[PDB]
UniProtKB/Swiss-Prot annotation:
Comment text on domains: The DFXDF motifs mediate the interaction with gamma-appendage subunits AP1G1 and AP1G2.
Protein name: Synergin gamma
Subunit structure: Self-associates. Interacts with GGA1 (via GAE domain). Interacts with GGA2 and GGA3. Interacts with AP1G1 (via GAE domain), a subunit of adapter protein complex AP-1. Interacts with AP1G2 (via GAE domain) a subunit of adapter protein complex AP-1. Component of the aftiphilin/p200/gamma-synergin complex, at least composed of AFTPH/aftiphilin, HEATR5B/p200a and SYNRG/gamma-synergin, which plays a role in the AP1G1/AP-1-mediated trafficking of transferrin from early to recycling endosomes. Within the complex interacts with AFTPH/aftiphilin and HEATR5B/p200a; the interactions are direct.
Localization per record: Cytoplasm; Golgi apparatus, trans-Golgi network membrane; Cytoplasm, Perinuclear region; Cytoplasmic vesicle, Clathrin-coated vesicle
Lineage: Eukaryota, Metazoa, Chordata, Craniata, Vertebrata
Biological source species: Homo sapiens
Job of this protein: Plays a role in endocytosis and/or membrane trafficking at the trans-Golgi network (TGN). May act by linking the adapter protein complex AP-1 to other proteins. Component of clathrin-coated vesicles. Component of the aftiphilin/p200/gamma-synergin complex, which plays roles in AP1G1/AP-1-mediated protein trafficking including the trafficking of transferrin from early to recycling endosomes, and the membrane trafficking of furin and the lysosomal enzyme cathepsin D between the trans-Golgi network (TGN) and endosomes.
Domain EH: from-to ranges: 19-112
Superkingdom field: Eukaryota
Length: 112
């Protein structure tokens, strides 16, 4: 997918996060799920995911761990960061570091 090259400007983050070429079904799903016509809405994300068996603690953290824009409005790519960490959490894999996202060739879709 992506190999490492010493470019002193290019980010070396997970390929699937910044792939703006296609938007995931998980995202359009999330529109139906918790999102609004006005964009991201964690408000519904809490009860649904906590009902999915996920912690309202981790759920809030997951919204907030958007690269390094915690108080920032989640953009589509940042919403890939949330989707994937939710997916891995459901799979019993906690979010420990960006290195762990690096270990996934492909990002899972959250089951809801």
């Amino acid at each position: 997918s992506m190999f490492p090259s010493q470019d002193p400007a290019q980010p070396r983050m997970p390929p699937w996060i910044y792939n703006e070429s296609l938007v995931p079904d998980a995202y359009k799903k999330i529109l139906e799920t918790t999102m609004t016509p006005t964009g991201i809405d964690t408000a519904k994300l809490y009860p649904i995911l906590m009902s999915s068996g996920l912690p309202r603690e981790t759920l809030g953290q997951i919204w907030a761990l958007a690269n390094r824009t915690t108080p920032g409005k989640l953009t589509k790519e940042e919403l890939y960061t949330v989707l994937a960490m939710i997916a891995v959490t459901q799979r019993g894999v906690p979010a420990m570091s960006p290195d762990a996202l690096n270990q996934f060739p492909a990002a899972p879709i959250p089951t809801l």
